[PDB]
């Protein structure tokens, strides 16, 4: 199916528009096993990553609710038209702003809100809001999305080590360890080649 899709993309590029040969570069993931292993680390626990993203979206939704109810006058966004607009006139806009401009920042949504003045009555509220966003949705959740990948890497490495040592140590048919064939007339390197040759069983 992948190869016929490749043919389809090639013919589209040849006839429809030359800007379809780009997708062909996604043969590097197929021609290579190392890159495929990295993408496997990404996409083995894919449900974990997607559910963590949904958790981040839920937290963004709650923070957007709080901002819309209380801090809706601090959601002011610079714009370049063809001077400064207001984001929070509707909870959907608050969610969009806090998900686009709040996740894509090193300090959370507090980097886009109106910069407060120390002599305001909402200053402690803004400080707590920004710090909570930064500590819950940018140091933990967006870091869980990466800790999951790291843990998946470790799991793949351990699984591959187990499989390889099983293959190179124990017999394929009888599952008999290598050490059992020490100080014996037949060595394990011979037991697997003449007696328990798994291809002789297929021939039989």
Ligand X SMILES: Nc1ncnc2c1ncn2[C@@H]1O[C@H](COP(=O)(O)OP(=O)(O)OP(=O)(O)O)[C@@H](O)[C@H]1O
Binding site for other proteins (CB under 8 A): 22, 25-26, 28-29, 32, 34-35, 37-38, 41-42, 53, 77-81, 85, 87, 89-93, 95-96, 99-100, 103-108, 110-111, 117-118, 127, 130-131, 134-135, 139-140, 142-151, 153-155, 157, 168, 178, 182-183, 189
112 or 192, CB closer to Zn ion? 192
CA distance between the termini of the chain: 35
User: Whose CB is nearest to ligand X?
Assistant: 172
Selection from other proteins, Zn ion, ligand X, none that 87 binds (CB < 5 to 8 A by kind) is other proteins
Binding mask 144-183 for ligand X (x = CB under 6 A): ---------------------------xxx----------
Structure tokens belonging to residue 32: 């290579």
The secondary structure of the chain, three-state, reads CHHHHHHHHHHHHHHCCCCCCCHHHCCHHHHCCHHHHHHHHHHHCHHHHHHHHHHHHHHHHHHHHHHHHCCCCCCEEECCCCCEEECCCCHHHHHHHHHHCCCCCCCHHHHCCCCCCCCCCCHHHHHHHHHHHHHHHHCCHHHHHHHHHHHHHHHHHHHHHHHHHHHHHCCCCCCCCCHHHCCCCCCHHHHHHHHCCHHHHHHC
44 or 178, CB closer to ligand X? 178
With beta carbons less than 8 A apart as the criterion, state whether 133 and 67 touch: no
* 99 annotated as a binding-site residue: no
| Interface region with Zn ion, contact rule CB under 5 A, candidates 35-43, 62-70, 77-85, 163-171 | 163-171
143 or 169, CB closer to Zn ion? 169
Selection from other proteins, ligand X, Zn ion, none that 28 binds (CB < 5 to 8 A by kind) is other proteins
Q: Is residue 198 a contact point for ligand X (CB under 6 A)?
A: yes
Binding annotation: 171-172, 174, 191, 193, 196-198
Question: Where is the binding site for Zn(2+), in residues?
Answer: 171, 174, 191, 196
Interface ranges with Zn ion (CB under 5 A): 171, 173-174, 196
């Amino acid at each position: 199916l992948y190869h016929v899709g490749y043919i389809l993309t090639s013919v589209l590029g040849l006839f429809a528009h030359e800007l379809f040969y780009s997708i062909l570069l996604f043969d590097l993931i197929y021609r290579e096993e190392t890159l495929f292993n990295v993408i496997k680390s990404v996409t083995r626990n894919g449900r974990s990553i997607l559910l963590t993203a949904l958790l981040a979206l839920i937290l963004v939704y709650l923070f957007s609710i709080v901002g819309f109810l209380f801090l809706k006058d601090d959601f002011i966004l610079e714009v370049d038209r063809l001077s400064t607009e207001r984001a929070c006139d509707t909870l959907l806009m608050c969610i969009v702003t806090v998900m686009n401009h709040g996740l894509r920042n090193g300090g959370g949504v507090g980097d886009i809100l109106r910069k407060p003045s120390k002599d305001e009555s909402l200053f402690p509220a803004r400080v707590v809001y920004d710090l909570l966003f930064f500590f819950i949705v940018i140091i933990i959740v967006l870091n869980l999305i990466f800790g999951v990948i790291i843990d998946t890497f470790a799991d793949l490495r351990s699984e591959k080590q187990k499989k390889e040592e099983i293959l190179k140590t124990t017999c394929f048919i009888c599952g008999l360890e290598r050490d059992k064939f020490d100080n014996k007339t037949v060595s394990f390197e011979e037991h697997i080649k003449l007696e328990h040759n798994m291809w002789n069983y297929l021939y039989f």
